[PDB]
Structure 1
Amino acid sequence: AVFERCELARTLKRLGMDGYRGISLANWMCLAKWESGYNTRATNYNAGDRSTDYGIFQINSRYWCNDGKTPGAVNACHLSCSALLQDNIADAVACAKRVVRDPQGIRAWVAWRNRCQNRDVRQYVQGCGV
């Protein structure tokens, strides 16, 4: 599914993302926007290290989910990477929360550093009722 901006904003808020571990809703929106364009079935294969990024947050298979084909990979979210390709984003949000409990927090995603950090992200939730 490809979410529309505000519907995704409310969907993430209902799922407990607003302020999760100090991360604003606007930050999560900026992340999903730049990672997949709000597309839950988005995928990116990384030929260099044999891993794949899955879903709306483009979560990587080397450490977070299991796809059975990434060498020496772990599964910290304890989910099949398939769960990150569903229209319903509950599992993806559970995994994204798991990612941020680690030291780096929201910085785990390089794209967040490139397009969201120290940027004006208000535009992502304006008019959405969140």
Structure 2
Amino acid sequence: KVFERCELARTLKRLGMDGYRGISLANWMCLAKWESGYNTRATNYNAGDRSTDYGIFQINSRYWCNDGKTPGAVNACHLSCSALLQDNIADAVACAKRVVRDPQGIRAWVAWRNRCQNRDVRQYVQGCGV
């Protein structure tokens, strides 16, 4: 499912992401936008390290979810990567919250660093009513 901007904003708010570890909803929206384009079925395989990034948050199969074909996987979210390809993003959110609880925080998302950090992101939630 490719969410609409404000639709996703309201969904993330309902799922407790606004202000989580101090991260605003606008920041979460910015990384979802640049990591997946708001598409829950987005999948990106890294041929070099043999791991895949799944879903709207592009979560890695080597550290957070288990897809069975990733060498040296850890599965810290205790989730089947397939759970991150569903239309209901509840599991994706619970896992995204786990990821930020790691020392690096939101710096785990490459796209946030390149396109959202130290930048005005208020545009992502304008007119959504969140």
- Structure 2 length-normalised TM: 0.98
Q: Which runs of 5+ in 1 are unaligned?
A: none
Query: Counterparts of 2:105 and 2:13 in 1: how far apart (Å)?
Result: 18
**1:66 offset after TM fit, Å?**
0.1
- For residues 21 and 10 of structure 2, the distance between their equivalents in structure 1, rounded to whole angstroms, comes to 18
Whether 1:68 and 2:86 are equivalent positions in the alignment is: no
Q: Give the match's secondary structure for 2:92.
A: helix
**1:14 CA displacement:** 0.1
Query: How far did residue 104 of structure 1 move?
Result: 1.1
Residue deviations 1:43-82 (CA, integer Å, cap 9, x gap): 0010001100000000000100000000011100000000
Distance 2:51 2:85 in 1: 15
Using the size of structure 1 for normalisation, the TM-score is 0.98
Instruction: Say how many residue pairs are matched.
Output: 129
Aligned residue for 1:21, secondary structure, equals coil
Distance in 1 separating the partners of 2:60 and 2:114: 18
In 2, the alpha carbon distance for the partners of 1:35 and 1:121 equals 15
Deviation, 1:15, is: 0.2
What is the Cα-based RMSD across aligned positions, in Å?
Answer: 0.4
Deviations 1:63-119 (A, max 9, x none): 000000000111000000000000000000000000000111111111110000011
Residue 109, structure 1, aligned to residue 105, structure 2: no
Q: Secondary structure of the residue that 2:65 maps to in structure 1? A: coil
- What residue in structure 2 maps to residue 12 of structure 1? 12
Q: State the percentage of identical aligned residues.
A: 100
Measure, in 1, the Cα distance between the counterparts of 2:19 and 2:82. 27
Matches of 1:37 and 1:16, distance apart in 2:
21
CA displacement at 1:125 relative to structure 2 = 0.3
d(CA) in 2 for partners of 1:105, 1:75: 17
| Separation (CA, whole Å) in 2 of partners of 1:102 and 1:123 | 28
SS in structure 2 at match of 1:118 = coil
Structure 2 runs not aligned, ≥5 long: none
